[PDB]
Amino acid sequence: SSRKELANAIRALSMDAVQKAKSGHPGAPMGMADIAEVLWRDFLKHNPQNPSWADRDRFVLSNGHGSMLIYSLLHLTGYDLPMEELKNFRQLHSKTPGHPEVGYTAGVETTTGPLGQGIANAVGMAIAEKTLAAQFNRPGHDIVDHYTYAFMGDGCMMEGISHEVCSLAGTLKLGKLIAFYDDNGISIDGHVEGWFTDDTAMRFEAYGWHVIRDIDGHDAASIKRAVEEARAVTDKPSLLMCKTIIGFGSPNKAGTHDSHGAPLGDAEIALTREQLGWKYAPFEIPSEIYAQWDAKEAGQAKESAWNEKFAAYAKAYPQEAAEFTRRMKGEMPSDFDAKAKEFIAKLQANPAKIASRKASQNAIEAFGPLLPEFLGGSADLAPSNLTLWSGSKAINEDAAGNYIHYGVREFGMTAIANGISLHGGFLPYTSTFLMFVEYARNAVRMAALMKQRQVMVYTHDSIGLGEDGPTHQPVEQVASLRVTPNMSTWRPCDQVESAVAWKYGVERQDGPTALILSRQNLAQQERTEEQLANIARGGYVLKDCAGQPELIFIATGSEVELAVAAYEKLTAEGVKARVVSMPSTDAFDKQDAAYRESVLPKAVTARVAVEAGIADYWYKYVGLNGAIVGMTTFGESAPAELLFEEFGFTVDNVVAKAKELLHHH
Amino acid sequence: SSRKELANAIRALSMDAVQKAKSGHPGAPMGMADIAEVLWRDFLKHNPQNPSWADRDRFVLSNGHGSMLIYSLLHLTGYDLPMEELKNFRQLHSKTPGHPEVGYTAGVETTTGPLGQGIANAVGMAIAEKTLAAQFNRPGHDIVDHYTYAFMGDGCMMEGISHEVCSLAGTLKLGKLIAFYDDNGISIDGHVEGWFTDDTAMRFEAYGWHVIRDIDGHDAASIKRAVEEARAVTDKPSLLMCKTIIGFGSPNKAGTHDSHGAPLGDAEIALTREQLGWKYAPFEIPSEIYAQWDAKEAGQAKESAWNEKFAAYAKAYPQEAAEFTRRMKGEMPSDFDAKAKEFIAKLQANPAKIASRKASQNAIEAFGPLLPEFLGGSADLAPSNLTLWSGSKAINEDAAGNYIHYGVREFGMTAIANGISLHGGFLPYTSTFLMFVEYARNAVRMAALMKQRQVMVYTHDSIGLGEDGPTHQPVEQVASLRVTPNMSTWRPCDQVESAVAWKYGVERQDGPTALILSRQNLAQQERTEEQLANIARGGYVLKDCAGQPELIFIATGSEVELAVAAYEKLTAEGVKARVVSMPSTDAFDKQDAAYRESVLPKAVTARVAVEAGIADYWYKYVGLNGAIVGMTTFGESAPAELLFEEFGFTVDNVVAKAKELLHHHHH
Ligand SMILES: [Ca+2]
Ligand SMILES: [Ca+2]
Ligand code: NA
Ligand code: NA
């Protein structure tokens, strides 16, 4: 069959699957089909029989609304994605959800849809390949050698995150990253010129990319030459400017916004079949077309050759090969749990009053030698977030390093780190001031949705940061993280809770962990062995009374000391009081009900939450008959000690709120 | 005095005020002082005695950590910012907070600090000037004519929002926007080349800006020539690449990251005075330096001339002049309240089961003729968010229009709109799918912090959007907005609540209002005149029983219909039930204790919340002895009606959960 006929198989499956679902996006799949045919059939290194092959090329659809493009490619090339799944596009619990989802579907590398994040993920995958190659390859043994290919459209280009990640990709000279821009002139509002006029090629040259202009995206020869040129440029990421017609093949909807995001309609599909010369019924693909698209034979041969290379590497470099396998599988070192517990116990036995941002740095220092998979960084705040340890080595200085200076790029940093975790081989950590989780907020959500392990180190967590004032002082950010599905959030009260939280984060297998860390020094709490072991349960009894409590303080982070001081005053008066430290609400909620009852007995309704964050969160644990010593406003610019007084974080106020509560009970 | 001596007054006040506070950022003020001296003394059109003069130039410090730069300028030029306030830099309730804040300090145009947002605000101010000039200027009467000047640094340049807003500024040919880039080679991690290597000039040329390269930022003549060149280019925004030395004057800390974000230290300040030749003690400025910096006499003359121009305009164009004054003051038309109430009453009397996104469009259509100040837009989703009305006209097509195609730029859109509201003359509305509030999230917060009027139209609010799936289906986003200080969030249940929420938003002068709008059609509920008036109280009794309820449903948005159906089933079985519609938790919380008790009586603990959003929010109103029919997970890609079934938003499940709750209460 001709290359155009092979590409038209994508067009037919895509328009037909959208039509059957009465939902979805036919235009971009039809516009990019010729580019995909060249890339996938002539260049992409992959094995449909093992989508987890460590050295496969990675493909990313940043314009993820065009999901039928990737489903068509996976089906046609022989992945485990049968025609019946394509006939179930956008239907409940199918393998073909409306935007592609990692884990749902063999061969999907990332969950995309939110524009701009796919290219960010691809930058992270390319950083991962470059770093892993530098760490593991040896003379005569290049066991890491693969490309990262991304498709992206006008929406990704307009989004600010594209600027963040493509700027950094240029700095890092990511010569195995090759992006294809679907330059079709159309977005949802219509002809893009009314709102998007960049000289995109000049912009990308300003980032240090190699740019190939004026590619005919409907001409296989033009596309193939451009890909060859990009592969020959080994010291710059490449952008291929592909002129395409959205909805290519449709006489009445090609080149129109109408083709972007709704079914073409039955009559228009019939006219499209006529224009394309496509003679097959919906969901019919002839054997000749499958024979030319199938990648099982070539893919198995390529993976088998790689397996033989890896076997030879393992003979010459046995310890390195074992580390490669462990890291690509995402497994932890067998002795990590014991060694981390030993560190935690040492901290409990050797008290220190330090900021939890410093306790975080100390945990990185302790775990660094044990976790060579760390690939950490900060968004231009290394000396404030405290993300460097003695073994940190910046990858812009040494490609085999373990640290990224991300610059002032919080959203891009977080979505790059999602790509790093998706690649395999690494455990990424990222960092900024907590307020700027808001810049990165959807990438944080995407880490949780994709079940990815990433530790997110958020410092300067409250009015305790002092004079920088209300634009920087978090109030409501932690509450939002706490109600995000599959997110773990820890607000440690001292250096011991900080190390437990770090351990919890690195040991998650199925989602991310945010650490909520103080600028100011935090006193260490004394703990029994039982309390020490129960920190990891997220909430535990820190101070207690004999018998059933009359009054329970629930406190987190920097406010535990205040709650303890109020507890001591009331205990001396003869109140049966308790303090619960709640470093992680999510870990607490996951405990068995007997444990939760032992900490927060259902019969004890006189509960006072204490936290320098938005009060409204705490109704979850105090209900309608408790009290909350929290924030209800933005902060103020002043020294931290005066702010804590101004906003009611005083022993007198906490005691008064508890006594007022005890009248009612 | 020489120009350098005048600039050194900024350096001295800045380093000394940071030192006294033992906190703050001396480096950028010291690095940009010569640029500021030229801009403010030779070009800026302003009147210190009236910071609200409608036709003043607007200045924005996007690198807002350098707050002592603007405080020095405002003090030296004669604004109401006494030296005592500079001595109280970063102290509680001073007029000199660590990052500048609009409202409390005379002459501060915007609250900045979060990097990139200042340049976005400046783009909005420049859009506002261009649009207001096109709407109001007449032959012989150019009553709107002013520049927007912005300072920005490497952090702003690295942030994605700078790409969004500077790209759009290029498309819109904002020839009165002039930005100065503090090109000093330093960020917090050190020398920027390890993480920031863009050819920034080439990047901005790709956006359609006029770029002036290689300006000596410590040479007044070079800076002045560059500003003159940028002012001569009337068809492009301009970027002035100013090579500066951070901490200029400090022998040991100039050019170092150490000068960025901590006091220089007393010993280093002494050496800096010696290098700069600045003899005056901390907080001492001689009368002759004030005489050269003061702008009161020039500012009075400029504003007086403008007032004469405006008086001549008002004689020739009296209705237009009255509209200009009204709009610049942020006042609403005198008949708006009555006309909007008439519209709301008509909707209550004429049911229509339509999506609240469509009810929103209908409110824009009804309000549009009454609010010529609207400057609305969507982030490339006009046909989905339903932000166009019959009178919309895109400003890229006609500069006197009222609509902005923002492109796929949610964060930039929202921070541009903050600039629009800060400028005066307009009432901005912005729009995207609700999920992508997360892209714009800090700009929403900044609107609330700055007490700005902006209506944020967020459509496709739940699993009700269907097949696009979990990356697009909001779950926890509304709860995040609800816990934001000074935010107003409305999730209307029908076309009537939608119109009430729109009226509330446009009339809310002291903060923003988000509308949480459905893709799918919403049943209209029956209301008495009192219930109709009670929508605006945020939470109200929609269905009731005689005597104390044994069950209260609390529902919002698309789930009110489900809660009412469950109420009807239970009522028919003899259960005493009530339904509360809670379109706005923030408005409800602002009602007095007696009203809140009347709606959610403390005696009734069997409360069931119903909302297709994150469940944990609702403990605030249901307590520990209730039930929540909510989401606890991400969504799924499927037809919406199947999602509502799968996630428990069915009458059978709501009734079962309510009966299970009552059974637990009984035993
Ligand atoms: Ca497009
Ligand atoms: Ca800088
Ligand atoms: Na290359
Ligand atoms: Na100009």
Tokens of A541: 């009894």
Smallest Cα distance from B301 to chain A, Å: 36
| Residue B297 Cα distances to A404, B10, B48, B302, B544, angstroms | 53, 21, 9, 9, 67
- Report residue A473: phi and psi, to 5°: -80, 110
Contact with chain B for residue A183, Cβ under 8 A: no
Gap between the Cα atoms of A320 and A605, Å rounded: 56
Domain match, A23 and A132 both = yes
Domain match, B417 and B524 both = yes
Residues of chain A in contact with residue B441, where contact means CB-CB under 8 angstroms, are 438-439, 441
Is B189 in contact with A381 (Cβ distance < 8 A)? yes
Beta B551-555 vs B577-581: how paired, if at all? parallel
CB A402 within 8 A of CB A390: no
Is A159 in contact with B439 (Cβ distance < 8 A)? yes
Gap between the Cα atoms of B14 and B69, Å rounded: 7
CB A422 within 8 A of CB A124: yes
Residues of chain B in contact with residue A92, where contact means CB-CB under 8 angstroms, are 636-639, 642-643, 646
Is A160 in contact with B412 (Cβ distance < 8 A)? yes
CB B479 within 8 A of CB B407: no
Give the CATH number, domain containing residue A63: 3.40.50.970
Contact with chain A for residue B94, Cβ under 8 A: yes
Is B195 in contact with A168 (Cβ distance < 8 A)? yes
Domain match, B352 and B482 both = yes
Total tally of structural domains belonging to chain B: 3
Decide which of A276, A299, A325 is a domain's last residue.
A325
Domain match, B132 and B218 both = yes
For A209, other C-beta atoms within 10 Å of its C-beta total 23
Gap between the Cα atoms of B250 and B15, Å rounded: 10
Residues of chain A in contact with residue B624, where contact means CB-CB under 8 angstroms, are 602, 605, 623-624
Domain match, A334 and A367 both = yes
Domain match, B368 and B430 both = yes
Q: Which positions ≥6 away from A244 have C-beta within 8 Å?
A: A31, A32, A35, A182, A183, A184, A217, A218
Gap between the Cα atoms of B413 and B429, Å rounded: 10
Contact with chain B for residue A154, Cβ under 8 A: yes
Domain match, B158 and B14 both = yes
Nearest-Cα residue of chain A relative to residue B189: A380
Q: Which positions ≥6 away from A235 have C-beta within 8 Å?
A: A173, A175
Ligand nearest to the Cα of A211, by number? 3
Tokens of A606: 């006189």
Give the distance (Å) from ligand 1 centre to CA of residue A18. Answer: 18
Phi-psi region of A195 (alpha: psi -120 to 50; beta: other; left: phi over 0): alpha
Gap between the Cα atoms of A431 and A360, Å rounded: 11
Q: Among A129, A268, A303, A410, which one carries the catalytic annotation? A: A410
| Residue B488 Cα distances to B341, B376, B451, B534, B556, angstroms | 20, 19, 11, 17, 15
Alpha helices, DSSP H, located in B79-150: 83-87, 117-136
Domain match, B36 and B177 both = yes
Gap between the Cα atoms of B56 and B176, Å rounded: 13
- Report residue B352: phi and psi, to 5°: -150, 125
Domain match, A394 and A410 both = yes
Q: Give the nearest partner residue to A203 out of B111, B189, B203, using CB atoms.
A: B203
Domain match, A317 and A367 both = no
CB B434 within 8 A of CB B447: no
Is B484 in contact with A476 (Cβ distance < 8 A)? yes
Q: Method used for this model?
A: X-ray
Residues of chain A in contact with residue B464, where contact means CB-CB under 8 angstroms, are none
Q: Among B410, B497, B559, B561, which one carries the catalytic annotation? A: B410
Q: Which helix (H) or strand (E) holds B490?
A: strand B488-490
Nearest-Cα residue of chain B relative to residue A209: B198
Q: Which helix (H) or strand (E) holds B364?
A: helix B356-367
Smallest Cα distance from B608 to chain A, Å: 14
Is B380 in contact with A112 (Cβ distance < 8 A)? no
Gap between the Cα atoms of B476 and A485, Å rounded: 8
Domain match, A17 and A136 both = yes
CB A124 within 8 A of CB A417: yes
Give which of A654, A558, A540 is closest to A608, Cα–Cα.
A654
Decide which of A510, A536, A562 is a domain's last residue.
A536
Is B623 in contact with A624 (Cβ distance < 8 A)? yes
| Residue B230 Cα distances to B116, B180, B237, B416, B566, angstroms | 22, 11, 8, 22, 66
Tokens of A214: 């004026």
The count of C-alpha atoms lying within 13 angstroms of the C-alpha of A476, restricted to the half-sphere facing its C-beta, is: 26
Looking up tokens 């780190």 gives A417
CB A513 within 8 A of CB A455: yes
Q: Which positions ≥6 away from B517 have C-beta within 8 Å?
A: B355, B356, B357, B359, B360, B434, B457, B458, B459, B460, B461, B492, B498
Per 3-state DSSP, chain A is made up of helix, strand and coil in percentages (nearest 5) of 45, 15, 40
User: Is B154 annotated in some ligand binding site?
Assistant: yes
Gap between the Cα atoms of A281 and A574, Å rounded: 83
User: Is B472 annotated in some ligand binding site?
Assistant: yes
A183 beta partners: A243
Contact with chain A for residue B104, Cβ under 8 A: no
Residues of chain A in contact with residue B447, where contact means CB-CB under 8 angstroms, are none
Looking up tokens 């707050």 gives B67
Give the CATH number, domain containing residue A547: 3.40.50.920
Is A405 in contact with B97 (Cβ distance < 8 A)? no
Instruction: Tell me how many residue pairs between chain A and chain B have CB atoms under 8 A apart.
Output: 329
Looking up tokens 């892993």 gives A132
Smallest Cα distance from A316 to chain B, Å: 35
Burial of A351 (0-12, 13-18, 19+ CB in 10 A): middle
Gap between the Cα atoms of A31 and A63, Å rounded: 12
Q: Give the nearest partner residue to B198 out of A24, A99, A206, using CB atoms.
A: A206
Residues of chain A in contact with residue B397, where contact means CB-CB under 8 angstroms, are 194
- Which of the residues B61, B165, B186, B189 would you substitute to probe the A interface, choosing the one with the greatest number of A C-beta atoms within 10 Å? B189
- Is A410 an active-site residue? yes
Q: What is the largest CA-CA distance in chain B?
A: 89
User: Is B25 annotated in some ligand binding site?
Assistant: yes
Is A160 in contact with B623 (Cβ distance < 8 A)? no
Contact with chain B for residue A398, Cβ under 8 A: no
Domain match, B301 and B342 both = no
Give the distance (Å) from ligand 3 centre to CA of residue A106. Answer: 27
Helices vs strands, H then E, count in chain B: 26, 20
Gap between the Cα atoms of A121 and A414, Å rounded: 9
Q: Which positions ≥6 away from A594 have C-beta within 8 Å?
A: none
Looking up tokens 């040329």 gives B205
User: Is B127 annotated in some ligand binding site?
Assistant: no
Structural domain for B553, as ranges: 537-667
Decide which of A325, A342, A358 is a domain's last residue.
A325
Residues of chain A in contact with residue B208, where contact means CB-CB under 8 angstroms, are 197-198
Give the distance (Å) from ligand 4 centre to CA of residue B138. Answer: 21
Is A634 in contact with B486 (Cβ distance < 8 A)? yes
